[model samples]
Target chain A: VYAQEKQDFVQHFSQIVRVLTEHPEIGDAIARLKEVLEYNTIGGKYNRGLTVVVAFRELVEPRKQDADSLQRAWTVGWCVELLQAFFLVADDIMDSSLTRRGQICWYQKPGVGLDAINDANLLEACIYRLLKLYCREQPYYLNLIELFLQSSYQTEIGQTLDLLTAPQGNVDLVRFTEKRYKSIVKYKTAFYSFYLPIAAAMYMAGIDGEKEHANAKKILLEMGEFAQIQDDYLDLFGDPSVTGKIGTDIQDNKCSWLVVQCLQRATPEQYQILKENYGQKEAEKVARVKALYEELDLPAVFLQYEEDSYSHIMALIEQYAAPLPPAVFLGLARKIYK
Target chain B: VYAQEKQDFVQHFSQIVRVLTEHPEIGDAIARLKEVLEYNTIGGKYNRGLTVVVAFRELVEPRKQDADSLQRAWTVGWCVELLQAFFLVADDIMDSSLTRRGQICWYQKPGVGLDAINDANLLEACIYRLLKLYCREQPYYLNLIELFLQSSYQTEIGQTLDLLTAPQGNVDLVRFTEKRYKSIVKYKTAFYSFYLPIAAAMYMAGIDGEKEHANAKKILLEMGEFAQIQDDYLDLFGDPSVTGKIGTDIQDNKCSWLVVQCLQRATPEQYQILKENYGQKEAEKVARVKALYEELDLPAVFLQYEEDSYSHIMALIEQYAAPLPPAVFLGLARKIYK
Candidate 1:
């Protein structure tokens, strides 16, 4: 089912390109924008985007989920994907990331450089263009625009907190509190990643009451936080072959969940070790920090936290996934927990 | 009249900040966003923004111009200013600019490097936030939203064109054709700067017919093009004391109006001079290019072109300004032509 929808979703890309480039005045930029949409929006796992399609399938009645309705869902799913691409392009620039999804980062590509900034903005603008093209007459048009806009805002705020809490070349573990870590993840990664797609589907399904969205957001955000925590843990502890990239949180001075946890449980001696070695790029210093985490039993602590988080999220779903089917939340949870 | 409207426009900014920061979880980011707004949005001449207020006053009947109506106009005016701020912030980063509005560029400020990318995104999100807060119930709410979003797309397209035409560290005068220059100016500067403010006012005044907007956009884009030509000419020829900044178009290899004119008329010898000196960093090379502009009589050419452009625009305004008063277009022309 997902495979068919994914294939259908990919097919709509050409239409978006056609509408945007149909203008005679666009000239060479038509080619540039097409490149931007293709390079950045593709290659993602499409989880956030697919959530819109999957949730729309679950939430709407079979009779109402006609061909047009499914097309709208797919279009909105791509909008979610475009929004993701926009953030990742900008974030790669901010993070000075060298690669993404096993390829050279868009900004880092030859002849691209900082030009990716405007390209990223173009990617974002494409979201509204696609929305306007596909969903303008729909009752939920403004709702989706506002949803995407708000998600961008929340993610930006999350990015701001993350940058401030762990500024590059400045390693201050004292600032890396668990509260700040959670705040950064929830705002930066979770809301848009988890809440936005499902909420979009809900609005499309005519399930836009504040109570329902609020309830869905509550469950989704918890799952999002748990998911990010796992990502942070995997960045360090997981195999590079499995994760597909080496983690740089330590060298990059990121406010990761492990570092936050390490700060919490460390003795003063252990804390001193972290303060000295946490953000260094040197192999030995990074290794020392890893050793310190081991000494503090952080791997076991992570296991305990991971299990606790999974249990807590399941309980939240049970309590708040009312009126709305549990399958929507359950599907998302299963992907993240696995 | 402009002074009071500008004051009111600046005052409404705090209310925008209040609503955005009212969220509990925004936490320390509240202070950061406030700073981004204050620093970037302030200091501009407010010409684009005040166009909304001024045009609104002209178009709306006095009886209909209630306090609430005026407030909406002012709010929309500030939204235009916010849009301007957003572009300028991001453009500064892309251009590698050192200063904007006589202060260090936002991205270049200590502790703000690269992070200004998100700051720029935040600035844009504030525009929608203000609109939703103020105009959600207005009959023309979606019109206003679509107008702003479209303007952003056009402007981003324009930015892409400008970057591609004059990439940093690569000077190619052959690509600097007058047609390409017009395309860049119309898309990159004119649509948002000229059409947007007055169009916002027109929408608020319930003058949203396609014909009226098409006419307004036609006239405004001409004015926008003429205005950018003046700016490009002024960059090298105008007094720094009056212009408030020294021009770097020669050294920066900007596809300036002067360069386009110089190319159209340059002898092979003069062209070679430009090809050698146009994007160089040394004082001598920059001076050589400036000297070549003089040898080709660009200042005289610019004067001729300026008068022609002004006359052409006046003709446009006279022909197009109908049903809507001529004064709305006249006021803007006077500012640019002066």
Candidate 2:
């Protein structure tokens, strides 16, 4: 059912690029922006964006899901993706990561460098432009604009906490408390990743009541936290082949859920071992941290947490997912848990 | 009269900071964001922001300019400054700038580094936050949001052209054309600095007709272009004691107006002199380029252009200033010309 919407979503990208590129004054900068949108916006799995489309389908009546409404939904979906692209491009630069979506990071591309900063900004500006173009006449336009802007703010706060917590070359485990970890994940990843899309769909479907959004946010944020914890768990234990990339949380001194749990559960000797080995660049040091995690039985701990999180989220869905269909939360939970 | 408004504008800064810092979930990030706002948002002349306040005073009826109305105007004024702060923070990172507004650049501060990317973004998010806080109930709220968003897009487009035309480590004079220089200045500086503030006030004061805005933009953009050309001239020719800063356009290969004018007037030999001497770091090479500018009598040329631009802007003021008191244009032009 969503395949056609997804296809339409991808196709609408050109309209956005054209709107920017066709500007009379942009000149050679047109080529640069076109490259920016193409390079950064399209490679993700579209989970966050697709959530908008799928949730819109679930939330709105079939009679109201007219062609234009579908187009607005798809355009708003792209806006979410553009928001992610903006964050990802800037994040990659901040993280000094060399690749994204299996290709060289936009910043790391030859001759790009820090100019990607402005490119990332341009991606963000495109979101508003698209909103004005597609949804300006809609009653929900301001809601969508506010939704995206607020999401960006939440995500930036999250990024700030993440960066401060995991400053490169500094391995301070004391700062990685579970409270701080949850704060970081909730602010950084959960709001924009999980809540924003469904919230957007809710707004679009005239489900703009505070209680409904609060309910949706409550459920989605839990899903987002669970998803991020899983990411943290997988970073150290999951196979590189299975995950399609090696994990660097230990070396990067990330406030991973495993580390937060280890801090809670570790013996003094094991804690010292982690403090000594974590955030080091040496392979041996990374392996030692991994070993410490194993000694702490963090993988087993994560499995239990995962199971608990899933049940807890299911409970949230059962309790909070009212008036709105449980299928919306169920679909998201299914993807995340699987 | 403007002094009180300016004072109120500065005083309102704390309220913006307090909202972000007082966020329940921000935690340690509160201190960081407070630092980002305090460090980056102040220390400038606040001219762009003051434009909003002063323009509001000029445009609105006295009955409508209540304490709450004045407060909204000041808050919106800070939004413009916040926009500038956002751009400057990111631009400093992109330009590898060492100092901004007489202090070390935020990115160059120890332990800040690339993390400033998110800080820059957080600064941007604060614009919308402040907007929502102050202007959410206002009818023109969306207008202000879209105006700021569009201005951001124009400025980013200008930045893209700038970075591309004058890529660091590459000295290419051929890219520095008069048309490109105007486009760059118009998009980069004119829209945000000149048009946005007045436009915001116009919207606030119920002066949002397309024709009225087009007229204001016409006069203000001309003022913006003239002001920027003056900056370029001052960079190369103004007294360091009076200007309070040394010029680096030549060394940095900036697409300044002086260089574009020089390109227009250079003979084959003069062009050779420029091509060889421009964008070089050595003092001797920079001196050669400066000497060539003198040989071309570019200072005399600039003096003439300055007078011509002043007259041109006054003529535009005469032609376009309508419904709006000519004093608005006159007041702005007086500052720029002086």
Candidate 3:
């Protein structure tokens, strides 16, 4: 079902590019923007963008899904993707990640470096431009704008929390607590990555009630948290080929769920090993950290935790996904849990 | 008149800080935001913030300017300043700037580093937060939102043009043209600096006509271009104490207005001199570039251009500042031209 939606979403780039570049004054900015749009905005799996379209289709009445409305939905889906692009580009720079989506990060390109800073900002700017161009006359326009802005703010704060707790090149285990970890996950990962796409769909379907959104948020955020924890787990234990990239959460001193769990369960000697070996980029140190994780039985802990989390999420959907179709939440759950 | 407004603008920081920090989940992000708010948002001349207030007072009727209306004007004024803060923070990082407004750049602080990337984004996000908190119910809410978004887009494109035209550590004089320099200055400097404040006031005063905005833009953009040219001229000639910091436009290989003009008039030998001397960190190279500027009589040319530019701006104000009070344009012109 989302295959067609994703194709159309990809095809709509011409219009998005045309509308932005139509302003004659853009000039050289137009070329730079074209390169930026092509580079950072297209490479992701685009699941967030697809989610917006899929949720909108399910939420809105079939009668209302006219050609124009569908186009608006598709454009908004791309806007969400644009938001993702903006964050990922800036995040890669901050994280100093070597690659994203199997290629060099936009910031890492020759002559790009910090100028990708402005390029990231331009990606964000395109979201609003798309919204204004397609959805400005719609009732949901302000809601969508505020949703994206609020999501951006939450993610930025989450990033700050994550950065502070796990300073790169510095091992500060004292600061990494479960409570702090969840705070980071909910704000940084769950809000934009999980809640925003659904909230956007709900808004477009005229589901602007605060109560409904609050309810949706409760489920979505839980899902977001669960997904991030799983990501942390996979980073340590999952195959690089399956995950599609090598995980550096250990070497980068990230406050990963595995490390947090290990810290809680570690013997004093195990803790000493982590304290000494964690956060170093050297292969020997990283291998030592992985050995410590294995000794702590982190993989079994992750398995049990995943099973528990899946049950909790089911309970959440049953309790909170009421009055909104269960399938909307269910579809998202399947995508994340799988 | 703006004395009280500027003071009120400065005092409103506590309330802005308080409202943002009241979100409990931010945790450590709150303290960091507070410091970001204090360090980057405050201490500028407050001219842009005050422009919104002053223009709002002039454009709106006295009866409409009640206490609530007045407070909203002040709050919105600060929102404009917040946008400026956002750009400056990110621009400093992109430029590797050491100081801003006579103090250490936020990104250059002892521990700040690239984390200021998120901090800069947080500052940008605060603009919308302030708007929603203060003016969400106002009829002009969407206008203010779109206005800021559009200005941000223009500025980002401008920054892109600036970066593309003048790469650091790589001199390329061929790209520095009168046309390209104006494009950079207009989008990078003018739209936000010139058109935004007055446009904000116009929106507040229920003047949403596109014609008025376009007309206002013509005059303001010219003024913005003039101010930027003066700035470029000063980087090579202005006093460090007076300008608040030493200039590195020459060593930085900036596509400065002076360089563009110098290129326009350079003899083959003068071009060769610039080729060898420009974009180098060595004092001798920088001095040689300055000597070439002197040899070409660029300082005299700048003086002539300034006079012509001021006259042109005044003419634009006379022609375009219509259906709105002249004092609005005159006020901004006085500030920049003086």
Candidate 4:
């Protein structure tokens, strides 16, 4: 099952490589999309893009890696990548990140600020364009467009909430509790990035109705939240040189893993340390915050939380695999983590 | 002919109004569409919007204003209005204009500068949404979406040309010739603003193929050129208090009717006068430019130009009346200017 889907993933990903390589001829229309978008968009450990192939493989019983299933999964996988591009581009702009995936943040580049907004739009349109080009004759073309659009609207609404809650560093601390943070990550990142690909593959594999896709979304979005938490965790503790750039969650005053943990575990004096040290552009303050995080054992606590969250979500999937295959969700979890 | 089509137009326009007025408990979503969009989007003097209606009306015989026909016409007409909104918001932002239709520009009001670009996107989406709502079941829906989308592409292309040609008042004088100016207006202003509405209407009527729409476009785009020229004329000579604000074509350094006229009529002395006086931020130089305009007999020339252009377009529409009905093309002319 794994080998079959892996072949499908490669085949699907190849078509993306093919069309994109010719982007220079589009007369610079795809300039930002090709340069900035394609760079940061790919190499998400290839997890979400890989999920569609795996899920489609699971859906096919006596599953053969035939051209039909491969094509279906391939197209849907790109839809996931495109969906990710949508989120990442908007996130780069909103967070005002200076770099993404070791490349210059698209908006921060010379002569590229608000133009990135339109490029984000054109990236979205390309998803449908690809769907129309490849999948329109298929029974699920309109269905695919609707699914992607709904996901986009949901993510936008989620980002709206996230932005509205914290437009700049001054946010109400009352609103920054763990529950709201979880909700933000779940809606803003996890649901689309995690659930969308797998569900899209499920639909492409001839799965219909909300019941089946609902379960897929349930398991996948949970992992999505966990994945983003891992990202936030890595932001501080991860080696900047190894990660290829320094983290700005501190200076940008992000609701990162370290801050949330400090909020949860810090004493009044430690909390004061956090208030003074977090979001400082100066190196000493950032170092002080890092020291406080170490003192609070934030890394160890996150490791424990990650292990528990992973097993809990897997257990939930295992519990809900009623008249269904556990391998589908399990396959996804194994692919992302390993 | 227009009187006859007005009945059909209003009947068709009402369907879109009904559907867009909208789904129950739409919450803030549709409300934002109406508030930020419909206030400026709907009432466009109906020339551009009704071009679709009238074009479709030309397609039908006995001119039956049936429920479906009316609904489709309404949707297409509203799409032209939507197309207008797509550019209007951005154009206002770029031009730094304060008011549009006696209301504060969307980009200037509150926290909506670059976000208006998103609103423009939402406006683009609403066309498809409305079409799908009212005409998704109709055979022409896809063609209509494609046509509208294609016209939008042309407008964007035209805009790129316009922006490139006139960047921040750098009047080298070589760029503002009549031919380039016409090309800019035709694509930028004429195609979507003039041709789109009628083409949409014609598609809904189901009376023609792509060629027929092209024929109508050939005639309608010329009318669009004239309409933009009329706007340029109105911008300078038209009463600002009545037009609701001051015109800055002279001072803001636009490629406009008066400037173009001065360029055409200026002796070397007059050219020097224009070179010095044009684009002056102060009142004295702007007054000198206005004085130069009178010296060049631009007002009468503009009157004669408008008259000649109107007759030329009317004659061209008449020439195509074999394929188009007077109610369709001629009706649009009278609707806008007469």
Candidate 5:
């Protein structure tokens, strides 16, 4: 329904990114911020932030935006990207990964460890500055600011849970079970990454309400959770280097989907295989875990689960898609699942 | 001149602090933001942050009343404090200090190392948020946000200069000369720390023009540099245990006031003493440095500098005393210098 809105958002986002990176004085600072933000912020193709611009477009009847309205929508959408920068910068510093999307992790870069978190913050502060500079003359400025702040707080709480559980090396099976993974994704990634962008736009477009936001939240949150589960499953089962780098989930004792599934289905022999080899970091140890997964046919099992879950989600969307804007959900699903 | 405005500022600054520190669920996601905001944000005797409030008070007729007036002024005053916290958090992380204001350094706290930089960014972000939240309805919100941002960028550049020149292992007396000392203090510490408060207040007070801001900046920047020089002097010559620190500026090879003075005035014998005793952590090495300082009568020289600098600043203030609010400078000096 709003493919053009999605395309406009991507172009606007790219423009903002270019402006930030092009500044000569911001050269080193931009490099560090990009490393951290790219790794955790840009992966999964930006389902949430793009949805914000799309939904905002749908809310207003004037489909053809004047330059001013278009600029305002695009800028607000960029704020969502900024919010993700905040999340990813903080998350990468906490996770201590080697590479994000093909580049070195921001913290791991030469002379750039940890301070990336601050660079992330600089990115966030720019959001409000741009907002005030461009949007304060509009009546909804106060409403927009308060919404972002509240959503950021929620995402932070979600981060608190994720960091507390997966803090490098001591991976208990309890932390890997379905219950915890569900909670982690819903709070940590779903709220800010998925829910925030769309919800913020609805407010700015004057379509805000507890009801409308909840419907968008409900659909996006499920997609986000399922998407992260795919990420976890792919790490061990999918080809390394194709995924851009070797998977470290098992070696790092992450709360991965494979681990959760193994806990649920593994016999005593299978459980012991994980106990001895998980988190070894050696090539042989990682291979042994993969071999065990192949024998269990975990790939087929995961596919079956995906089919059932996809059906359930579509049903829910059909039921509530009216009165809530079907185009927002369709656009979001395309971003996440396509 | 605006001393009567003091009570209202304290009340307003306190309220913003209260709101920010709420929602502890975010954990240390807001670490530097909280610490920088908390540590440098409050318990100060008020010059920089409070000056804005006083200047603002001068612009308003006491008889005129608006319920939102005090809250708006108070919010902007806290913006000044938040700006300071941003610098202090990053400084603490870079300087490797153990404690700030008698609390464990936020960077050193568990789960938050290096991430403190992001927290500092958050403190800075909150300033713009507060401005847009409370004063966007006013004509000057954009003015205040842009002013703070430009001032902050200059301050960051100045800090980079200080870091590059005065980094660990004090070497090359050329870098420690008096000219470098003044330049360092002026760029790195003076502008944001000193001029930001009053400039912000001038905007809030609806007194727009380059002239008034320039006049205020002229006095504040010089005063800020003088104050930083005093801080450098105190680090080497004051009662360290009383200051809750043993003053490691010599061992850190910092571009301290002591080093600059020694470079300027040291005789052949004194030069040899500095070369031999600098950057040694040993007890006897400290004693040797102290002995050289004694021979130079360093204590008396610093006292004379302080006395001379104070009168110069006072003389400058006397010129602005009629055209400007006395509470602006007096309030700031009393808060920071003591």
Candidate 6:
């Protein structure tokens, strides 16, 4: 059912690419911008972008979901993707990562060095440009703008917190407390990923009441938190082919949930093992950390935690997904719970 | 008279620093953001920020300009400064500069490094936070938001063009044509510097007509172009003690106004001299390019061009500075022309 919506979302995304590059006076800037758009955007599965379309279709009446409405929804969806692209490009640079979504990171691309910093910003600027172009006349224009800006701010703060908690080349596990981990994940990943698209859909459906957004947020953030923790869980234990990228959360000394749980569960000798083996680039050292995780039965612990998180999120949806269709919440839930 | 406005601008700027940092749940991101604010933002001259206050005062009735209006003007002024800060911090990183305003660049500070990318973004975010806090109720709120976003987009594109036109370790003088140089300066420097603050004051004074903003933009962009060319002139030949920053235009292969003019005026041998010495970090190579500029009489050419540019801008002001007080354009012209 979502396949057609997905196709439409992908097709309409080109309009943003076209609108931003159309001005003749932009000259050579257009070439750089085109490269930025091609490389940083469009590689992902576009789950977030498609979410806007799916949720909008669910929220609006069948007849109200006309061509114009669908176009606005897809454009807003791409705006979210652009926001994601903006964050990922910068995140790759900060982490010094080699690849993203199976390709070389934009910053790591030849000749694209620190200029990717500005390139990432160009991706961000396109969000507002697309909004002004397609949705300026809508009542939700200001609301959507505020939503994107606030989401960007929250994600930036979260990235800051993540960077501070886990300095590269420094194995400071003491800062990897559960509280800090949750705050980082919530602010960095959950708000934008889980809530923003659905929230955009809610606004499109004319559901602007504070209470309704608060309710959607309560459920979506929980789902988002569950999703990120699932990602952390899979980074160590899942298959790269299935995930479509190599995981570096361990080698990069990230303040990951796995590490935090291991830290909490370790004996002093096991702690020594972690201190020696965690955050090292050597394959053997990483293997030792993975061995320790298995010895402590973390995979089973992950299974239990995953079950618990799913139950908690389902409870949240049951309680707060009212006033909007349960299907809106349920649709998002199915995407993540898998 | 401007001294009081500068004082208020500085005083209110602290509130932005405080509000962003005061959230307790932010953890150590607050400390890093504090360092970023301290390092990148406060050291600049407040000319851009104070322009808002001065323009507001010029446009509004003195009786209606109460404490709240003054505070909003100052806050918005600081938002402009914050925008400048955001650009400068990132620009310093991209330019690989050593210092800014006599202090070490924020990205170069110990333990900061590429994390300054996120910090710079946080600085940009605070603009909207302050706007929502201070101007959410005003009719011009969305106008101000779009104004800032558009300004930022223009600047980023300009910076991209400058970067592309002047790649390090490459001496492609053909790309440094006068036309390309003007496009870079207009997009990168003029819009935010000249039009933003005065246009902001217009919005606050309830001037929302598109024709009026277009007229103001025409005049302000011209003045901004003159100011930037003057900046380029000073970078090559002016005193560091007077300008407060060491010149690196020749060494860095900048697509500067001087270089463009020289390219236009150079004979084939003079062009050969430039192609050989431009973009080199060696002192002798830089000096050779400087001597070539003198042999081409570019300084005298610049002096004549400056005079002609001033006359052209004066004509533009005479034609366009209607439907509003002439003092606004004259105030900005005097500041730059001096």
Cα-based lDDT at residue B243, candidate 1: 67
lDDT of 1 by residue, B205-290 (tens): 99989999999988999999988899899888887657655566777778888889988998888888889888767989988988
TM-score of chain B of 1: 0.95
- Kindly list the per-residue Cα lDDT of model 2 for residues A257-304, writing each as its tens digit: 888998999889988898888877799999888888788788888888
lDDT of 2 by residue, B255-294 (tens): 9998998999989999989988887679999999899999
Interface RMSD of each: 1.1, 1.1, 1.2, 4.9, 5.8, 1.1
Provide DockQ values for all models, in the order shown.
0.75, 0.78, 0.76, 0.16, 0.16, 0.77
Model 4, position B105, has a per-residue lDDT of 80
Residue A25 CA error for candidate 1 (Å)?
2.9
Better DockQ candidate (1, 5) = 1
Clashes of each: 0, 0, 0, 8, 7, 0
Question: Candidates 1 and 2: which is better by DockQ?
Answer: 2
lDDT, candidates in the order shown:
0.87, 0.86, 0.87, 0.68, 0.68, 0.87
Runs of candidate 1 exceeding 4 Å displacement: A1-8, A240-246, A280-283, B1-5
The TM-score that candidate 2 achieves is: 0.95
The 10 consecutive residues of candidate 6 chain B with the worst lDDT sum are B1-10
Task: Residues A58-95, candidate 1: write the lDDT tens digits.
Answer: 99999998988988998899899989999999988887
**Candidate 3, residue B151: how far the Cα is off, in Å:** 0.6
TM-score of 6: 0.96
lDDT by residue (A1-338, candidate 3, tens digit) is 65675677788878877877774656777988888988888866777888888899999999999999999988888888889999989988887777777778888888899999889999999999889888988988888999999999989989988888878778788877898889999989999988999999999999999999999999999999989999899877877656654577877788888888988998898889999999888999999999888888889988898889989999999999978899998888878786
For residues B1-338, could you state the per-residue lDDT of candidate 4 as single tens digits? 65675565555544555566452322334455556565557544556666665566567765578866665666667777776877777677655677777667887777555546546656666676676667778777766766776676556545545544554546656666786677767767887877777766666667557677677777888888888888887777887555554466666677775687689888999898888877657789988988889888888998898788888987887777556667767667776565
- lDDT measured at residue A323 in model 5 versus the true structure, 0 to 100: 78
Q: List the residue pairs that clash in candidate 5.
A: A118-B117, A118-B118, A251-A279, B33-B119, B47-B331, B47-B332, B170-B253
lDDT of 5: 0.68
Instruction: Tell how far residue B298 is off in model 2, in angstroms.
Output: 3.0
Name the lDDT of candidate 4.
0.68
